[PDB]
Design a protein around this nucleic acid. Structure first.
Ligand code: MG
Length: 36
RNA sequence: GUUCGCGAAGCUUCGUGGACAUUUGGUCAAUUUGAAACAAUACAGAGAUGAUCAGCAGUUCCCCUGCAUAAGGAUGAACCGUUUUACAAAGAGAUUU
């Protein structure tokens, strides 16, 4: 059948889409720091 | 045109030097030939497995709907096929020098 297992994943870079994702929206702009 | 000065005619009118203001818009030009899709007809037609059916993924130089990192698309699409060598060692028989 085609109900099939696998060998490897992927990572290929295209031109960015420019879509306004919900999570990507700004939040926690301030980074904290340590004392020293 | 505005005007601030000069020179001629009768504050009114011509002739001049300046100052003011200064380069728009087009990745495009209006019907077939620079690329939309559904639909329709005809023809078939539904994942495993015997059959019926659920859902989830996975790979991809396939996308669509979706605000979407939800979710959904025929289990969304194509995958179901082709598949003969890093190839050596031992034994037996045969023709050629
Ligand atoms: Mg289904």
């Amino acid at each position: 059948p085609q109900l099939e297992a696998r060998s490897g994943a992927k990572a290929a870079a295209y031109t960015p889409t420019g879509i306004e994702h919900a999570r990507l929206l700004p939040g926690h702009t301030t980074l904290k720091y340590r004392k020293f």
